[PDB]
Every structure is written in C-alpha cells, then in structure tokens.
Amino acid sequence: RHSMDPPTFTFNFNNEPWVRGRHETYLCYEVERMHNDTWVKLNQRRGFLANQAPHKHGFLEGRHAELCFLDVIPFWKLDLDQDYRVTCFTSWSPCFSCAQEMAKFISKNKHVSLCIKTARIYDDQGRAQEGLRTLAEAGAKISIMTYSEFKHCWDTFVDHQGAPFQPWDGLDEHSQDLSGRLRAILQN
Numbered sequence: 765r766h767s768m769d770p771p772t773f774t775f776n777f778n779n780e781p782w783v784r785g786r787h788e789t790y791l792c793y794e795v796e797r798m799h800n801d802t803w804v805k806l807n808q809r810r811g812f813l814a815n816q817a818p819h820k821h822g823f824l825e826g827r828h829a830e831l832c833f834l835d836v837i838p839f840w841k842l843d844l845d846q847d848y849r850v851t852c853f854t855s856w857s858p859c860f861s862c863a864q865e866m867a868k869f870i871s872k873n874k875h876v877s878l879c880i881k882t883a884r885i886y887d888d889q890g891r892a893q894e895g896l897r898t899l900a901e902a903g904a905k906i907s908i909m910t911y912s913e914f915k916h917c918w919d920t921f922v923d924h925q926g927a928p929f930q931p932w933d934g935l936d937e938h939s940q941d942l943s944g945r946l947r948a949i950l951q952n
C-alpha cells in the first residue's frame with residue numbers, strides 16, 4: 765500500500781479552469797462513526813482510488829471512480845444499526861449516471877451520510893446538473909473544496925515526505941467561483 769504521488773495529486777486536484785487533460789477522476793475517502801453524539805474517525809477505513817481504463821474488448825467505458833467507490837463500501841462491513849459519515853474528496857464531480865447510482869445507494873443505506881467535496885464541477889451541459897440536484901435531494905451534502913480541504917487531502921492522502929501543502933496560483937479565486945456556481949446549480 766502506498767500514499768498518493770504528489771505530482772498526481774497536484775495535477776488532478778488543481779482547480780484552475782483553463783487547463784485540459786485531467787481525464788481521470790481521483791477519489792479520496794474517509795469514514796466516521798457516530799459515538800455518543802460525536803463523529804469519530806475510523807482511520808483503517810481511509811483510502812483512495814481512481815477511474816478505470818476501458819477493457820481492450822471495447823464497447824464499454826472504463827468503470828468510473830464513483831462506482832468503484834460504491835463497489836468497496838460493502839466490504840467495509842459497516843454495522844447497519846450504527847451511523848456513519850462517509851466523506852469523498854473528488855477531483856471531479858460525478859457524471860449524471862454516477863450521481864444517480866450514488867443517490868440510489870444512499871436511499872437504500874440509511875446508516876450512511878454521504879459528503880462529497882469536489883475540486884471542480886464537471887458540467888457537460890446535459891444531465892450533469894440534474895444529477896447533482898438529484899444526489900442532493902437524496903441527502904448527499906455536496907460542496908466545493910477550499911484551501912482547507914486541499915491541505916487536508918495533501919496531509920492525509922499524499923506521500924508528502926514532510927513537505928507542507930503549497931497552494932497553486934488562484935486556488936482561493938477558483939474555489940470561490942465554483943462555490944457560487946454550485947449554489948446556483950443546487951438552488952436551480
């Protein structure tokens with residue numbers, strides 16, 4: 765097991781709008797359990813993953829990070845009588861069908877409260893916004909990553925070799941613009 769490579773982190777979680785080539789989606793997750801009215805981190809549950817490449821046979825897209833995330837949750841063997849808060853830090857927001865699947869998951873697993881904190885919004889000008897609205901309606905808390913979340917991911921998920929988090933240019937500007945955009949999506 766290895767932590768995330770720093771250049772991988774930086775390349776993927778960079779929130780600058782005017783670059784291209786971030787085809788992947790990285791997803792960092794943490795789990796908390798409610799213990800006497802206090803959320804308590806379960807640190808064995810921490811991890812990260814990314815979207816998969818398509819199989820050489822063709823026709824099918826590579827499995828999206830969000831589905832793989834949903835794939836592993838049952839193996840956590842969470843106690844259905846207990847309460848958990850599951851937080852994902854994602855480089856991109858979910859596509860519509862991933863949002864739909866995530867909405868179905870949280871619908872059927874009331875022991876989980878899902879929080880999605882995303883570096884960037886992927887809006888395909890199609891159903892993406894519907895998906896975010898639908899996921900929020902099902903009870904997911906969707907928000908935009910700020911300095912605080914980026915630093916946390918760096919400290920927690922990245923192989924940093926003691927180096928502190930160094931914000932890239934415009935991190936706060938972009939984050940503020942995205943928060944506004946997300947507010948407009950979720951009230952729209």
Ligand SMILES: [Cl-]
Pocket residue numbers: 783784785786787
């Ligand atoms: Cl991109």
Ligand SMILES: [Mg+2]
Pocket residue numbers: 780781933934937938
């Ligand atoms: Mg900029």
Ligand SMILES: [Zn+2]
Pocket residue numbers: 819821
């Ligand atoms: Zn296959």
Ligand SMILES: [Zn+2]
Pocket residue numbers: 828830858859860861862863
């Ligand atoms: Zn997807």
